[PDB]
Every structure is written in structure tokens, then in C-alpha cells.
Amino acid sequence: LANGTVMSGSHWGVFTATVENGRATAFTPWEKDPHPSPMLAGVLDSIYSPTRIKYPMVRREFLEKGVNADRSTRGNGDFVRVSWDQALDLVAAEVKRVEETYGPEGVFGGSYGWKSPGRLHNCTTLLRRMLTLAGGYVNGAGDYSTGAAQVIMPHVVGTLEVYEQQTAWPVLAENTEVMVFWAADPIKTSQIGWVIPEHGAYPGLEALKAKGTKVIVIDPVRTKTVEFFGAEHITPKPQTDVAIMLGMAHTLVAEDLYDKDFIANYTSGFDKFLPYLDGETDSTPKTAEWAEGISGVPAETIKELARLFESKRTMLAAGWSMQRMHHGEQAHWMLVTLASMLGQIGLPGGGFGLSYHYSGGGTPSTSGPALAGITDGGAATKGASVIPVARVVDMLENPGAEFDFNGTRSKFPDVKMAYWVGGNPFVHHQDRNRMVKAWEKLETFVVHDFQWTPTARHADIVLPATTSYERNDIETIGDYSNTGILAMKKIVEPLYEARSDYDIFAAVAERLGKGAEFTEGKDEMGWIKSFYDDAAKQGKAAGVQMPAFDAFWAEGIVEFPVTDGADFVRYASFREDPLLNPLGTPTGLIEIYSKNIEKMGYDDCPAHPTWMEPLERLDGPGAKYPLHIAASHPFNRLHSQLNGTVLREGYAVQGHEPCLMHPDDAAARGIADGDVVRVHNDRGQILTGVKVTDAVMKGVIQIYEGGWYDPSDVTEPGTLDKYGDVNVLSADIGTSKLAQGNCGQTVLAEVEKYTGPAVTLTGFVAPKAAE
Numbered sequence: 063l064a065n066g067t068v069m070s071g072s073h074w075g076v077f078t079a080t081v082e083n084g085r086a087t088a089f090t091p092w093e094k095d096p097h098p099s100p101m102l103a104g105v106l107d108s109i110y111s112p113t114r115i116k117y118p119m120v121r122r123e124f125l126e127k128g129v130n131a132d133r134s135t136r137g138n139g140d141f142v143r144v145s146w147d148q149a150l151d152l153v154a155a156e157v158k159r160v161e162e163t164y165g166p167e168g169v170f171g172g173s174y175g176w177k178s179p180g181r182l183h184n185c186t187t188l189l190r191r192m193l194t195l196a197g198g199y200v201n202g203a204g205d206y207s208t209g210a211a212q213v214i215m216p217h218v219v220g221t222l223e224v225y226e227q228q229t230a231w232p233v234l235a236e237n238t239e240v241m242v243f244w245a246a247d248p249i250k251t252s253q254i255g256w257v258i259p260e261h262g263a264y265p266g267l268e269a270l271k272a273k274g275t276k277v278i279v280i281d282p283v284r285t286k287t288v289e290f291f292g293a294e295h296i297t298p299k300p301q302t303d304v305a306i307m308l309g310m311a312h313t314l315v316a317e318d319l320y321d322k323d324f325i326a327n328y329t330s331g332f333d334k335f336l337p338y339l340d341g342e343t344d345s346t347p348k349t350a351e352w353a354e355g356i357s358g359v360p361a362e363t364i365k366e367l368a369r370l371f372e373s374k375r376t377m378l379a380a381g382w383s384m385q386r387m388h389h390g391e392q393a394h395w396m397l398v399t400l401a402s403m404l405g406q407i408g409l410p411g412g413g414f415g416l417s418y419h420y421s422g423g424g425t426p427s428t429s430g431p432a433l434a435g436i437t438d439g440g441a442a443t444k445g446a447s448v449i450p451v452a453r454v455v456d457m458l459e460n461p462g463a464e465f466d467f468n469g470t471r472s473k474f475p476d477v478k479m480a481y482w483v484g485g486n487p488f489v490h491h492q493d494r495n496r497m498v499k500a501w502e503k504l505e506t507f508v509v510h511d512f513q514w515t516p517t518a519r520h521a522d523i524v525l526p527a528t529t530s531y532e533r534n535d536i537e538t539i540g541d542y543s544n545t546g547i548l549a550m551k552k553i554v555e556p557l558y559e560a561r562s563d564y565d566i567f568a569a570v571a572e573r574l575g576k577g578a579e580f581t582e583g584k585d586e587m588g589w590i591k592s593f594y595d596d597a598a599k600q601g602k603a604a605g606v607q608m609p610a611f612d613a614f615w616a617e618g619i620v621e622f623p624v625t626d627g628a629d630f631v632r633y634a635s636f637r638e639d640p641l642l643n644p645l646g647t648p649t650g651l652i653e654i655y656s657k658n659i660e661k662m663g664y665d666d667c668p669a670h671p672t673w674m675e676p677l678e679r680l681d682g683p684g685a686k687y688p689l690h691i692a693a694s695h696p697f698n699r700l701h702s703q704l705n706g707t708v709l710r711e712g713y714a715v716q717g718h719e720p721c722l723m724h725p726d727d728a729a730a731r732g733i734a735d736g737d738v739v740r741v742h743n744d745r746g747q748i749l750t751g752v753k754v755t756d757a758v759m760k761g762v763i764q765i766y767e768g769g770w771y772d773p774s775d776v777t778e779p780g781t782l783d784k785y786g787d788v789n790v791l792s793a794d795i796g797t798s799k800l801a802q803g804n805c806g807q808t809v810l811a812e813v814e815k816y817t818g819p820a821v822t823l824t825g826f827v828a829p830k831a832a833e
């Protein structure tokens with residue numbers, strides 16, 4: 063058996079494995095990693111944990127009755143083990159059946175998910191590759207992270223903006239006077255990357271603190287970001303940031319401080335927004351006093367923040383949680399508007415940034431080539447075919463109905479089958495109880511995972527995939543920085559009967575009479591060497607030298623150099639000469655008023671930043687429930703990933719997902735730290751374990767997304783979730799008609815001490831038949 067050490071990487075970093083007798087015993091972080099993530103140990107554990115899927119399983123119910131099966135028992139664990147040959151025959155037969163009977167419109171292949179890094183083993187791309195061969199599929203658009211923001215930004219600043227390189231960290235260190243983290247926790251969220259992360263924010267953040275720069279954090283939770291800086295902490299009532307931004311704009315007009323020259327030469331439509339702000343259209347002057355009434359943040363604090371921002375070089379780095387809410391589009395729309403009023407856009411250290419908390423945005427880019435991998439075919443091949451990702455349940459329930467998106471109207475397709483790889487829709491999608499009944503509409507549900515997630519438990523057919531550590535691959539290090547290219551080397555042998563997604567899709571393409579079209583005559587290393595060679599020819603033309611494939615593989619990593627990437631300032635050419643370098647909007651300037659959006663006529667998305675009542679907010683007129691659940695991203699998980707590993711022991715409370723509650727709120731309900739609580743609203747009910755702290759502001763509770771749903775009974779509508787899936791409580795509604803994003807953080811609920819029967823958690827052990 064093997065003994066040695068092997069370097070690879072993941073979403074958490076670059077590391078070195080220790081193999082002892084064919085088993086990975088340790089994962090040590092890369093030596094050049096400036097801030098390793100404590101979650102690496104969990105990543106190793108996920109290879110071997112008890113919820114690891116061993117064999118191909120077919121739902122008992124589906125085996126005997128097929129399309130006539132009772133679809134309400136999905137998730138109950140009654141699975142039949144089958145040979146791989148049987149399972150593959152079944153999946154291909156079923157795919158072809160739905161394509162002949164229903165067409166391409168009957169197959170939903172959006173398969174949303176964070177999967178695993180790697181240009182060869184990209185499961186989601188691989189599934190679309192096979193589905194393209196099978197006749198076609200219905201795809202998904204946008205994502206759950208910036209659902210609202212990515213659609214509205216292009217109407218305002220000209221591009222997406224959220225997934226674009228930021229003004230470099232170094233530039234901030236020498237120039238920024240005030241750093242504002244608005245609804246962002248960069249210490250927490252910078253641990254992972256979409257591709258191998260370099261952890262570039264950490265050094266950037268330390269340079270700021272060493273420099274003495276003033277840092278202001280505007281968030282309901284007392285995060286690690288607040289603690290690292292010992293920052294000034296503004297705690298708004300969740301969902302009231304737009305009011306605050308309006309209040310701050312009012313002061314600025316009220317005391318005549320805003321930058322009139324900036325507004326005049328770089329923006330458009332401001333004079334159509336002024337009336338609104340002054341109260342001339344609705345009789346409600348958007349003052350600090352007015353904003354205080356809605357946000358709960360002292361009026362004078364609001365006036366002082368606005369003055370301090372106008373007289374110092376300020377950077378507003380805003381998170382994305384505040385756009386994962388009803389009317390999400392106004393959050394960043396108002397922040398650009400407020401940034402525009404201060405006049406620092408395009409100045410070194412000033413402006414705003416939407417990616418400083420995500421995937422190393424702000425880390426200087428190198429000049430290395432770009433890496434590419436397997437594609438799904440489409441650019442060389444030949445109802446609606448694309449739906450906004452968060453409208454998947456609506457689709458299912460309303461086949462044929464119309465829907466609005468970015469100014470157009472389309473019809474939902476009539477889907478009969480869902481194929482999901484590398485994602486966890488039974489943990490990530492809002493309103494679990496709505497989705498559970500909606501899934502009954504689907505004839506067949508096929509899932510690939512290596513962990514028995516709530517999504518896998520609910521499948522008709524489940525196939526065991528391997529991790530990234532049981533195969534070979536190549537991937538980039540740094541989403542923005544392009545630090546290097548990594549060889550993701552095989553560590554151990556595929557466990558039990560696990561197989562790569564690629565191998566499973568090759569096999570299914572073969573039964574559709576299309577194998578050579580899927581594989582292209584190449585094997586694993588064949589594909590990897592062709593990606594590397596492509597980048598190497600690219601690098602060569604740009605004067606970046608790169609080893610030959612085997613040389614590169616022997617080293618395992620290639621790093622590229624940094625030339626002028628540490629001097630980059632977002633929006634500097636635009637500010638320097640706006641006529642020569644205009645924005646990509648109709649007017650070519652920052653659009654505070656949108657004629658385009660006004661033409662659309664959407665009630666829930668006016669033509670300028672506007673404050674509207676959300677479906678439900680804390681202390682809102684007629685709100686039924688008292689506490690706001692900050693259903694944010696987890697510290698010790700990557701969404702739902704790593705929940706079924708040893709890491710769960712350090713945060714679970716009585717075996718449940720933790721719930722951070724304020725001492726006053728706990729007293730009132732006679733709740734003691736450590737208790738099991740019932741969290742419920744009109745949508746659903748969950749159990750969690752309480753941690754009492756004054757970190758969370760009064761009126762708000764913290765239950766992170768990612769909890770593995772554990773229903774007491776799948777046949778009982780509204781069954782209590784035993785573990786703690788926060789999406790049992792969220793509502794499933796589009797943000798507005800413009801983007802149709804998800805409102806996953808628009809949740810209100812009530813908490814009580816659980817005094818019911820004892821409960822047995824069953825989600826962290828595999829199904830009896832799967833042992």
C-alpha cells in the first residue's frame with residue numbers, strides 16, 4: 063500500500079496529504095498560504111465519514127412502479143442496492159424516454175451547485191455535455207449569491223460589477239482613510255474560493271490595521287471583522303439599509319456637502335431622484351430622523367457617518383446579503399447612488415467595491431495566461447429554455463404560465479425530470495415545505511454526490527461519485543489574482559464503488575449511442591495535458607514562460623509574475639476622461655435614473671433607487687413574527703459542505719445546528735444557553751440549539767444556511783425538521799420582476815424552548831440499506 067505525500071487543492075486551499083498504507087491521514091496547508099482555513103480537516107474527513115455513499119442505489123418505490131410510484135415517500139430511506147450496470151441502463155433509458163416523450167423542455171439540467179474545482183472534473187458542465195447529446199435540456203440563469211445585483215448593475219454602471227477585479231489592496235493601504243464594510247464579513251467569507259483560493263484578503267486586511275485606517279462595520283452581528291479591527295459597529299435592523307443610505311443622502315443635500323461637479327459630469331438622472339429624496343412626490347422627506355424610525359439607528363449617527371464619508375477618502379465595500387432579500391436590486395443601486403454623491407469614484411482608495419469579501423477580490427492580478435477546460439458542446443452543435451435559478455419551484459407548479467425577467471416575458475417549460483450533480487437544492491432552496499410537495503410533479507429525479515445529503519436521500523436514483531482527491535485534475539489558483547496553475551493530483555483510490563462523474567456520464571453517453579462524441583477519444587491525462595498545453599501556448603505568446611507538461615506535473619505548480627497589477631484602480635480611466643472612456647450604459651454615465659427600467663413598467667422595481675416595504679421585516683407595520691433570522695453563510699461549512707464530518711462537533715448544540723440568541727430575547731422566552739429550541743413561522747418549523755451572546759443585536763437571531771434537513775416524517779406535511787435547515791422557514795418569492803433573485807434572508811420567525819418528545823437525529827448516518 064502507498065506511503066508518501068501528495069499535493070493538491072480544493073475550495074479551501076492548496077495542501078499536502080500524508081498517505082499511510084493507502085489512506086490519507088493528514089492534510090497540511092501549503093507553506094505559502096498566508097491564512098489557511100481551519101476547515102481543511104473536515105475536507106479530509108468527508109472522504110471517509112459515515113455519510114459517504116458507497117453503492118448505486120435505486121429508490122424501492124421507483125424500481126417497482128416507475129412513473130406510477132408514490133412520490134410522497136421520497137426521502138424516507140427505502141433504497142435498493144443495484145449493480146452499476148443496472149443503474150446506468152436505468153438512467154439512460156429514463157433520459158431517452160423523457161427526451162422522446164416530452165422533448166428537451168422535459169429535462170431540467172441547471173443542476174445548480176458549488177461542486178468542486180477542476181477543469182476536467184466539472185460535473186455540472188459534464189452533465190450538460192451528456193444532456194446536449196441526449197436531445198437538449200432546460201437550463202438555469204444567474205445564481206443565488208448575486209441574483210438581484212448582477213441584473214441591476216448593468217443598467218446602472220454598465221457591467222455586472224460583482225464578479226470583477228477590485229481596486230488593489232495595496233492601493234487601499236496607501237490611500238484609504240475610512241474603510242466601511244457594509245453588510246460584509248471578509249474574515250469569514252474569504253476562507254474559500256470558486257477556484258483554488260489564495261487567501262489574498264488576509265494580508266490586505268492586516269495592512270489596513272497596521273496602517274491605523276478607520277474601519278466602520280455596518281452589520282447586525284458582531285463579527286470577526288468587527289473584532290479584528292475593534293471597529294465602529296453600526297447595527298441596523300436587518301433589511302433597512304436602503305433607508306439609512308437615503309437618510310445619509312438627505313443630510314448631504316440638506317447641508318449642501320455632496321459633490322455637484324461629480325454628479326454633473328459623471329452621472330445621469332439625479333434631478334429626477336432629488337424630488338423623491340426631498341419628499342416632494344410622496345410628502346415624506348427622507349431624513350435621518352425618518353430613517354431612524356425605520357432602521358433603529360440613531361439619527362445623529364446617520365448624519366455623522368455621512369459627513370465623515372464626504373470629508374475623508376472613503377471606500378464602501380459592501381456584501382451581498384442585503385440583496386438576498388425582497389427588492390434586493392435597491393441595495394447596491396442606492397449604494398452606487400450614495401457613492402456617486404460623495405465623488406470619490408475612480409480615485410485611488412475611494413469609490414465602492416462589491417467583491418472585497420469574495421474569492422480574493424482586490425488581490426493583485428498576475429499577467430499569466432487563462433486556463434480553460436471541458437465544455438458542454440453547445441458552441442459546435444446545433445416553453446423557455448432558460449429560467450432564473452431561484453424560480454425552479456414556480457416552474458414545476460406553473461407549467462405554461464408567464465414570468466417577467468429583465469424587461470421580457472417568457473413561459474415556463476413543462477419539466478418531468480431533474481438531473482442534479484454537484485449541488486444541494488434540498489438545503490439551498492427556499493421554503494422547504496413548498497418544494498417538498500412541488501417535487502412530486504417530477505417523474506424521475508437523479509442525483510450524484512459522495513455524501514448522503516438531503517438531496518441524495520430524496521432521489522429516485524443515487525450514484526456514488528468520487529471526491530476530487532480520488533482523481534487527477536488541473537485548476538487555477540486565484541479567481542481574480544491568477545497566481546498560478548495547480549496540478550490537483552490523485553491521493554487515494556476511489557472508495558467503495560464510487561466513480562468520477564466523467565466516467566458515469568461517458569457510460570450513459572455510450573448507451574445513447576454517443577460515446578465517442580462525449581469522450582473525444584481522450585482519457586483523464588489526455589484532457590489535462592491539452593488544457594495545460596493551451597495555456598502554455600497562450601503564456602508563450604504573452605512572454606510568460608511555462609514548463610513542458612511533465613515538468614509542470616513533477617513540480618505540481620506554476621506561479622506567474624505580477625507586473626502592473628498592484629496599481630490597478632477600479633474606475634480610474636472613466637474618471638480621467640469620460641468622453642474617451644464611457645460606461646456601457648445608454649447614456650455612458652452612472653445612471654441614477656433609468657429610462658430603460660422606467661419603460662419596463664415594473665411595480666416592484668421603479669426607475670430610481672426607492673424604499674419599499676418588504677414582504678416581512680422586523681418591527682414592520684403589522685409584522686406577525688418577532689425575530690429576524692440572519693440566515694447568513696456559515697463559518698465552519700461551505701454552504702452545506704462538511705456538515706457530516708468531525709467539524710460538526712465544535713459548533714453543534716445538543717446535536718443541532720446552533721442558534722445565536724441575545725440574552726434579552728432568551729430571558730423573555732425563559733430560554734437558557736444550551737437548550738434545544740423550536741424555531742417556527744407560518745411556513746415551517748425547525749429545532750436548533752441556542753448559544754446566548756450579545757454578538758447578535760436584540761430582535762435578530764443567527765441561524766446559518768447549510769444545515770442538513772432531517773424530517774421526522776416525509777409523509778407529514780410541515781413535519782418538524784430535527785436538525786436545523788434554515789430554508790424550512792424562508793419564503794420562495796422573486797426579489798422583484800427585474801431579476802427574480804431569491805429572498806433567502808427575508809425571514810421572520812418566533813422562537814420557543816422545545817418541550818416536546820425526545821428526538822433522534824438521523825441525517826448524519828447513511829440509510830440502513832446503504833451500509
Ligand SMILES: NC1=NC(=O)C2=N[C@H]3C(S)=C(S)[C@@H](COP(=O)(O)OP(=O)(O)OC[C@H]4O[C@@H](n5cnc6c(=O)[nH]c(N)nc65)[C@H](O)[C@@H]4O)O[C@H]3NC2=N1
Nearest residue numbers: 175176177178206207484485486490510527701702703806
Ligand atoms: N437562506 C439562504 N441564505 C443564504 O445566504 C444562502 N446562500 C445561497 C448561496 S449564494 C449559494 S451559492 C447556495 C449554495 O448551495 P450549493 O448547492 O452550491 O451547496 P453545497 O453545500 O456547496 O452542495 C454542493 C454539493 O456538491 C457535492 N459535490 C462536490 N464535488 C462533487 C463532485 O465532483 N461530484 C458531485 N457529483 N458532487 C460533488 C458536495 O458534496 C455537496 O453536497 O446556497 C444558497 N442558499 C441560501 N439560503
Ligand SMILES: NC1=NC(=O)C2=N[C@H]3C(S)=C(S)[C@@H](COP(=O)(O)OP(=O)(O)OC[C@H]4O[C@@H](n5cnc6c(=O)[nH]c(N)nc65)[C@H](O)[C@@H]4O)O[C@H]3NC2=N1
Nearest residue numbers: 207245246247250251280300301381382383694695700701
Ligand atoms: N466561510 C465560508 N462559508 C461559505 O459558505 C461561503 N460562501 C461563499 C459564497 S457562494 C458567497 S455567494 C459569499 C457571500 O458573501 P455574503 O456578503 O452573501 O455573506 P453573508 O454571510 O450571507 O452576509 C454577510 C454579512 O451580512 C450581514 N447582514 C445580514 N443581513 C444584513 C442586513 O440586512 N443589513 C446589514 N447591514 N448586514 C446584514 C450578516 O450578518 C453577515 O455578517 O461568501 C462566500 N464565502 C464563504 N465562506
Ligand SMILES: [Mo+4]
Nearest residue numbers: 205206207208
Ligand atoms: Mo453563491
Ligand SMILES: [O]
Nearest residue numbers: 205206207208
Ligand atoms: O451562488
